[PDB]
C-alpha cells in the first residue's frame, strides 16, 4: 500500500531522460513515464532543473503534453515557485508539490504551502531549516514539529495532505557523521508517526545508495525502503521496476543490508565493507 513516485525523470539523475529533454525527443519521454507506470509508479516525479538551462521553457514545453499523454499525477520536483505554477497551471488535481523547505525562512515556507492548500495539491515538506539539514533524530522532530504547526494552524492544511521528509543520506562513505544517519531517519519517522497522527511521509530512498555497484544499490533500497515502511513511510521515490521484495534478496545479502542500515558495527567487522564485499564475491 505504499505510494511509488517513479524517481526517473530527472535530468540530474537520469543520463536516459536529459538526453531525450535536451533533444525535444517528446514520444521518447513518454515512453519513459509509461514504463515507470506499469512497473508500479502510481505517480511521477518530475525535475528538470539543471544548472545554465530554463527550467520554465522545458516545463511549458513538457507540462501540456504530460496532461493529455498520462493519467498518474505528478510531483513536481522544483525550488523554483513560477516552476510550481506552471505545474498547478496545466495539471489541475495532478500535483504534488516538492517541496517547501525553511531553509529561506518563513515567507518562502508560506509561499509554496498556500500553493498547495489554494490548489489542493498534496505538499512534501523537509526536514531543513535556517541552519540546514536535520541529520540526528532529535533535529528531524523538531524542524518537523514547527512546520505541522504552521501548516495546520495558519494554512489550515489537513495532515493526509502533507508529506513528511526526513531526508535520505548515503550510507555510503563511512564516515562517521554519515554511517547512522538513515538509522537516524528511521528512528525519527517511528516517532513522528505517534506524535503526528494522520500525516504522510516520504523518502528518496535511492540515495541512501550512492557509490555502490548497481546490483547492491538495488538490494539496499529495497530493504531500506521496507525499514522505513514499517517505520510508518506512506509514500516513496523509487526507481519502480528495481525493488526487490524482500524473499528474492538472498539471506546474507540481507541480513548485510540490515547491519550498514542500522550501523552495526563490532570489532573485527565494518558493515560497509562486508557488504561491497558480499557484491564481488556473489
Ligand atoms: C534527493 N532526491 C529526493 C527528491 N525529492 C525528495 N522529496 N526527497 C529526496 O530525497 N528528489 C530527487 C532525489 C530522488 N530522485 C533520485 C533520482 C535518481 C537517483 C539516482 O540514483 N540516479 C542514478 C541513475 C544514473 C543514470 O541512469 O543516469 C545515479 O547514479 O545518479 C537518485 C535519486
Ligand atoms: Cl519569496
Ligand atoms: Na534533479
Ligand atoms: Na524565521
Ligand atoms: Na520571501
Do not use: C
Not at 115 to 139: P, S, Y
Not at 178 to 195: D, N, W
Not at 252 to 257: F, K, Q, R, S, V
Amino acid at each position: 500500500s505504499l505510494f511509488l513516485v517513479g524517481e526517473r525523470l530527472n535530468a540530474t539523475g537520469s543520463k536516459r531522460f536529459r538526453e531525450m529533454l535536451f533533444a525535444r525527443d517528446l514520444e521518447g519521454i513518454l515512453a519513459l513515464a509509461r514504463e515507470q507506470v506499469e512497473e508500479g509508479a502510481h505517480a511521477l516525479d518530475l525535475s528538470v532543473a539543471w544548472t545554465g538551462r530554463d527550467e520554465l521553457e522545458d516545463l511549458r514545453w513538457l507540462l501540456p503534453h504530460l496532461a493529455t499523454a498520462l493519467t498518474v499525477p505528478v510531483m513536481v520536483d522544483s525550488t523554483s515557485p513560477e516552476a510550481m505554477e506552471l505545474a498547478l497551471k496545466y495539471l489541475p488535481g495532478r500535483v504534488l508539490l516538492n517541496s517547501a523547505n525553511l531553509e529561506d525562512g518563513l515567507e518562502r515556507f508560506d509561499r509554496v504551502a498556500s500553493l498547495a492548500k489554494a490548489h489542493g495539491a498534496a505538499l512534501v515538506v523537509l526536514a531543513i531549516d535556517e541552519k540546514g539539514m536535520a541529520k540526528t533524530r532529535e533535529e528531524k522532530v523538531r524542524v518537523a514539529l514547527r512546520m505541522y504547526e504552521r501548516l495546520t494552524e495558519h494554512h489550515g492544511l489537513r495532515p493526509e495532505d502533507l508529506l513528511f521528509d526526513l531526508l535520505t543520506f548515503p550510507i555510503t562513505q563511512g564516515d562517521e557523521e554519515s554511517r547512522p544517519l538513515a538509522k537516524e531517519t528511521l528512528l525519527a519517522m517511528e516517532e513522528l508517526r505517534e506524535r503526528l497522527p494522520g500525516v504522510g511521509f516520504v523518502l528518496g530512498v535511492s540515495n541512501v545508495s550512492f557509490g555502490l555497484k548497481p546490483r547492491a544499490r538495488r538490494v539496499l533500497n529495497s530493504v531500506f525502503l521496507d525499514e522505513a515502511r514499517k517505520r510508518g513511510l506512506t509514500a516513496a521515490i523509487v526507481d519502480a521496476g528495481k525493488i526487490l521484495p524482500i524473499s528474492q534478496i538472498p539471506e546474507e545479502a540481507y541480513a548485510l543490508a540490515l547491519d550498514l542500515i542500522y550501523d552495526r558495527r563490532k570489532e573485527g567487522f565494518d558493515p560497509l565493507l562486508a557488504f561491497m564485499a558480499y557484491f564481488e564475491a556473489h
